Amino acid sequence: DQLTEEQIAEFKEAFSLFDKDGDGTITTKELGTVMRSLGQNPTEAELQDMINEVDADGNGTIDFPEFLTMMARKMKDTDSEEEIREAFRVFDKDGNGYISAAELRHVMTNLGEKLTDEEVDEMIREADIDGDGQVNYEEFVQMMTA
Amino acid sequence: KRRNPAANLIQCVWRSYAADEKSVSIATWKKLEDLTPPLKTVIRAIRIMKFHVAKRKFKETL
Ligand SMILES: [Mg+2]
Ligand SMILES: [Mg+2]
Numbered sequence A: 001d002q003l004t005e006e007q008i009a010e011f012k013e014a015f016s017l018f019d020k021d022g023d024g025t026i027t028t029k030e031l032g033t034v035m036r037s038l039g040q041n042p043t044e045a046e047l048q049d050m051i052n053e054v055d056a057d058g059n060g061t062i063d064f065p066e067f068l069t070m071m072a073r074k075m076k077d078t079d080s081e082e083e084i085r086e087a088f089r090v091f092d093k094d095g096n097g098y099i100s101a102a103e104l105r106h107v108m109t110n111l112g113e114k115l116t117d118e119e120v121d122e123m124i125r126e127a128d129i130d131g132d133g134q135v136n137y138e139e140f141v142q143m144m145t146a
Numbered sequence B: 001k002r003r004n005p006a007a008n009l010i011q012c013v014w015r016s017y018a019a020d021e022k023s024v025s026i027a028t029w030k031k032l033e034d035l036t037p038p039l040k041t042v043i044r045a046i047r048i049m050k051f052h053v054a055k056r057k058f059k060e061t062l
């Protein structure tokens, strides 16, 4: 799956909502303005962290080329597939490749940026599609890798 | 142990996936409705950036 000319025009559109001063760069101040305009309340350490991990050139800001590679890659690259897969094995203590839906719903509503009951309900419905209480995280990763 | 970083990375994967154009979800846009198409791309760009932060935080626990 590759990128069409239309979605590039939509990617520039969204890029220009971050780059509100129109100089072709996104700073932590521009990004923080968009996020807090969407109800978020991030700290600059988080704002600086969000810019750094997508700052390919390392110049401190996000230009449209970096923004374009970020939106087209999604979580489909090899580094992301291996890392997302390794993140699921941390809870696959049986070593078989399966994680109980009750356990996964429990950890996702108690650790990290915990999902709420509405969010986790939609996730378990797609993690345990057949409804047997078990999650094939290898098939679940490739589902969201696409 | 990498329990919390792995949990946070999985959380960013779902929120990014649930927000994607070919996906359907109402709990990933809780209290966010009738959104402009560029507005949805902006939220998708934010959640993708959160994912790369989570992946870097989880990798550094190795
Ligand atoms: Mg700018
Ligand atoms: Mg840059």
Ligand SMILES: [Mg+2]
Pocket (backbone or CB within 6 Å): A127, A128, A129, A130, A131, A132, A133, A134, A135, A136
């Ligand atoms: Mg199942």
